[PDB]
Design a protein around this ligand. Structure first.
Ligand SMILES: N=C(N)NC(=O)c1nc(-c2cc3ccccc3o2)c(N2CCCCCC2)nc1N
Length: 245
């Protein structure tokens, strides 16, 4: 996250930290995600596509920091890693950038909701807030495009949903953005998602409720003018989500 603020897992208690075991047993951070039910985290396929073996992965819930433990956190193995059949990668844009991890502990349990661990609602079918609606994003992604390291502490910031029509302008993304995506940006382009934030939540208040409207997917650079964040539009994927859960 570029700009915004530090936070703690209590302000995004559905946020999932996803890591990978190297051969040799070093663990690096992969991507964010969101708990949508006690056994299921939703993320971006582009996160796992290079190393698609589920045994490689580790999921934490109730975690506020990248490389320190947080009192209350729960650690999970991936019992299932479901990548979207119709995924593709062009120059910039991921298509069908959506994945499902079914989490289970060594002692064979799903998430136990707590003050630091909660689910987030999916939206109703093809129902998203109006353009200019303010939503939140969360992750351990870079603070600056140039940064070598990820932050130790979770971040969140605020972006404004951009009209489909405005995102498709040639000097934004042209046709790279389809109806199964969303754009969001700062009016001043000064805060944004970045490398390390992929798979994480774009949360909007909808029928006055905290609702998972988006999954961080891509963008050109981070916090670049006429270069919004692009999000997987969860409200065009409920059949897929229901069908695979
Ligand atoms: N909201 C946005 N504008 N962008 C984003 O959401 C985003 N950006 C990048 C990005 C582009 C870039 C260029 C130079 C330095 C750092 C960079 O990071 C990003 N990566 C980082 C590379 C590893 C695989 C995942 C793709 N993911 C994003 N989801």
């Amino acid at each position: 996250i570029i700009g915004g603020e530090f936070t703690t897992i209590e302000n995004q208690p559905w946020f999932a930290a996803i890591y990978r075991r190297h051969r040799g047993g070093s663990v690096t951070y992969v991507c964010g995600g969101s708990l949508i039910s006690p056994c299921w985290v939703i993320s971006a396929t582009h996160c796992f596509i290079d190393y698609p073996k589920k045994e490689d992965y580790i999921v934490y819930l109730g975690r506020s920091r990248l490389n320190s433990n947080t009192q209350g956190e729960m650690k999970f193995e991936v019992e299932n890693l479901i990548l979207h059949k119709d995924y593709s990668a062009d120059t910039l844009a991921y298509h069908n950038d959506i994945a499902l991890l079914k989490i289970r502990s060594k002692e064979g349990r799903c998430a136990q909701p707590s003050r630091t661990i909660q689910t987030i609602a999916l939206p109703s079918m093809y129902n998203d807030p109006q353009f200019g609606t303010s939503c939140e994003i969360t992750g351990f992604g870079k603070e600056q495009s140039t940064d070598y390291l990820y932050p130790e502490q979770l971040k969140m910031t605020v972006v404004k949903l951009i009209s489909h029509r405005e995102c498709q302008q040639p000097h934004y993304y042209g046709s790279e953005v389809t109806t199964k995506m969303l754009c969001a940006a700062d009016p001043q382009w000064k805060t944004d998602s970045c490398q390390g934030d992929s798979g994480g939540p774009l949360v909007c208040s909808l029928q006055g409720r905290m609702t998972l409207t988006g999954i961080v997917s891509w963008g050109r650079g981070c916090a670049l003018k006429d270069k919004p964040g692009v999000y997987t539009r969860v409200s065009h994927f409920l059949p897929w989500i229901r069908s695979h859960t």
